[PDB]
Amino acid sequence: KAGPVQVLIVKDDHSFELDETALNRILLSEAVRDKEVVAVSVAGAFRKGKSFLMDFMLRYMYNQESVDWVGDYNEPLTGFSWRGGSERETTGIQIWSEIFLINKPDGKKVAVLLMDTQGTSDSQSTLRDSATVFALSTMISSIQVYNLSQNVQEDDLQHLQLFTEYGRLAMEETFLKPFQSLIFLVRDWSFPYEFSYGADGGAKFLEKRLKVSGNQHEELQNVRKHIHSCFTNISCFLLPHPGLKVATNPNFDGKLKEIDDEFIKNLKILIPWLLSPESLDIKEINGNKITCRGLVEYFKAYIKIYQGEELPHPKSMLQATAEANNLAAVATAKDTYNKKMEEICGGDKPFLAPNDLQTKHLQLKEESVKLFRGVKKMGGEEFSRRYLQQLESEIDELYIQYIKHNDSKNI
């Protein structure tokens, strides 16, 4: 019997593990391994109904040819594990064990893979944990549902930009856009009188939100340009709140009779708009359509890159800013020392007595140390200590170079 399968395992030590056996068993079966694959993912902040949504996607995938695929209104919602409570439920990445075979309007018979992910920003996860899951699901899926709550905030765009860039870094160089379809799914949209629920309201909302204009600040322009650069198709769907019973009742188990009717009405539109045979886009990587067997190889390849240390680590805004502040200050203090030493023992300056050279070096070292300390930096003085010691060590190294330059002028 079909069920969810844990394929990306996140460990308590923040390491990642691919369950290759379970993955090979689902995607290398004879019926699917050679078919071109459509991979649908949902990702975004944790505790926002992602697994819940995926389980309605499952109902549609099993009952496409039925007018009432949304189900019996007394049927509980099953599949991927979903629940209330403040603590995360999904970890890593899970896929549905049954690969769906669908006929496109082309006549092409394609394999459809459904992928559910650990929400970002939970209380147990580093930024590297969250970015790796989100980048991997974007790199593997051909349709990425970016699940957002209520609105699209500038920090939603900055996270998307960080995660997609992290994905790009693990990918081979390419002249085409790295990714395919992205849907901004806005849950609990509260303003249907400003933009109607659904795809047409969402398209107008998103055009406004992502619009680049010349009078816009560069920081605002650049995040929008980066998002457009990454995806060949970007859509948006505004979804109503499903009712306070769905959000707050601990006995709720997914029965449609307990879900707000306007939510159901739009949910019935959203799922086929995402998953109908005409809207299923086959996965492509660097301009080649991928089969299920091909997808398995890329999954293994990408995880290995993220398991190693070839790529830089994503860092928080304060941590990354502190590091850049300190690196820039080291460079400035070191450059100051170099140019000041050139004034007293550059090539065109006379030989200096060794004791004089030492006195002037110690003075110029102290001046560069005071320059470094005086620059305002994020992170605090304790964070700076490592960079202060590096600075002093590199200046001491430079000094020995100058001892030898000076010595050459008295031979």
DSSP string, 189-214: E--TTTS-SBHHHHHHHHHHHH---T
Task: Specify the 3-state DSSP secondary structure of 80.
Answer: coil
Distance, in Å, from the CA atom of 35 to the CA atom of 398, rounded to the nearest integer, reads 62
Q: Does 268 bind ligand GDP (CB under 6 A)?
A: no
> Minimum CB separation from ligand GDP for residue 191, in Å?
8
User: Taking Cα atoms as reference points, which of 102, 97, 179, 94 lies closest to residue 144?
Assistant: 179
CB 128 within 8 A of CB 163: no
Q: Does 242 bind ligand GDP (CB under 6 A)?
A: yes
**Binding partner of residue 325 among ligand ALF, a second copy, ligand GDP, none, CB under 5 to 8 Å per kind?**
a second copy
> Minimum CB separation from ligand GDP for residue 27, in Å?
23
Angle formed by the axes of helices 381-407 and 317-345, nearest 10°? 20
- Ligand-binding annotation for 386, yes or no, is no
Q: Which is nearer to a second copy, 317 or 353 (CB)?
A: 317
Write out the residues near ligand ALF by the rule CB under 6 A: 46-47, 50-51, 88-90, 118-119, 122
80-84: list long-range contacts, CB under 8 Å, 24+ apart: 80/4, 80/51, 80/54, 80/55, 80/116, 81/4, 81/51, 82/49, 82/51, 82/52, 82/55, 82/254, 84/247, 84/248, 84/249, 84/250, 84/252
Q: Which is nearer to Mg ion, 113 or 329 (CB)?
A: 113
Q: How far is CA 250 from CA 76, 225, 253, in A?
A: 14, 42, 8
Whole-angstrom distance between the N-terminal and C-terminal Cα of the chain? 88
Instruction: List the helix and strand counts (H, then E) for the chain.
Output: 12, 11
> Minimum CB separation from ligand GDP for residue 337, in Å?
50
- Ligand-binding annotation for 188, yes or no, is yes
> Minimum CB separation from Mg ion for residue 50, in Å?
5
The correct pick among 17, 19, 165, 284 for binding a second copy (CB under 8 A) is 165
User: Taking Cα atoms as reference points, which of 119, 117, 154, 127 lies closest to residue 312?
Assistant: 127
- Ligand-binding annotation for 72, yes or no, is no
Q: Which is nearer to ligand GDP, 178 or 240 (CB)?
A: 240
**Binding partner of residue 78 among Mg ion, a second copy, ligand ALF, none, CB under 5 to 8 Å per kind?**
none
Q: Which is nearer to Mg ion, 93 or 292 (CB)?
A: 93
User: Taking Cα atoms as reference points, which of 227, 213, 56, 260 lies closest to residue 154?
Assistant: 227
Q: Select the span of 52-60, 116-124, 268-276, 295-303 touching a second copy (CB under 8 A).
A: 116-124
- Ligand-binding annotation for 51, yes or no, is yes
Q: Does 187 bind Mg ion (CB under 5 A)?
A: no
CA atoms within 13 A on the CB side of 89: 14
Q: Which is nearer to a second copy, 104 or 405 (CB)?
A: 405
Q: Does 84 bind ligand GDP (CB under 6 A)?
A: yes
CB 184 within 8 A of CB 206: yes
φ, ψ at 302 (rounded to 5°): -60, -45
In the DSSP assignment, the letter for residue 258 is G
> Minimum CB separation from a second copy for residue 350, in Å?
10
> Minimum CB separation from Mg ion for residue 321, in Å?
27
The correct pick among 22, 369, 378, 388 for binding a second copy (CB under 8 A) is 378
Distance, in Å, from the CA atom of 71 to the CA atom of 194, rounded to the nearest integer, reads 31
- Ligand-binding annotation for 205, yes or no, is no
Q: Does 380 bind a second copy (CB under 8 A)?
A: yes
Distance, in Å, from the CA atom of 217 to the CA atom of 215, rounded to the nearest integer, reads 7
> Minimum CB separation from ligand GDP for residue 150, in Å?
7
Q: Does 89 bind ligand GDP (CB under 6 A)?
A: yes
The alpha helices in 34-107, defined as continuous H runs, are 50-62
CA atoms within 13 A on the CB side of 41: 28
Q: Select the span of 49-57, 142-150, 190-198, 378-386 touching Mg ion (CB under 5 A).
A: 49-57
CB atoms within 10 A of CB 215: 5
> Minimum CB separation from ligand GDP for residue 66, in Å?
23
The correct pick among 16, 166, 231, 299 for binding a second copy (CB under 8 A) is 166
Residue nearest ligand GDP by beta-carbon distance: 49
Task: Specify the 3-state DSSP secondary structure of 188.
Answer: strand
Q: Does 125 bind a second copy (CB under 8 A)?
A: yes
As annotated, the binding site for Mg(2+) includes 51
Q: Which residues bind Mg ion (CB under 5 A)?
A: 50-51, 90
As annotated, the binding site for GDP includes 47-52, 118, 187-188, 246, 249
Q: Which residues bind ligand GDP (CB under 6 A)?
A: 46-52, 82-84, 89-90, 119, 187-188, 239, 241-242, 246-247, 252
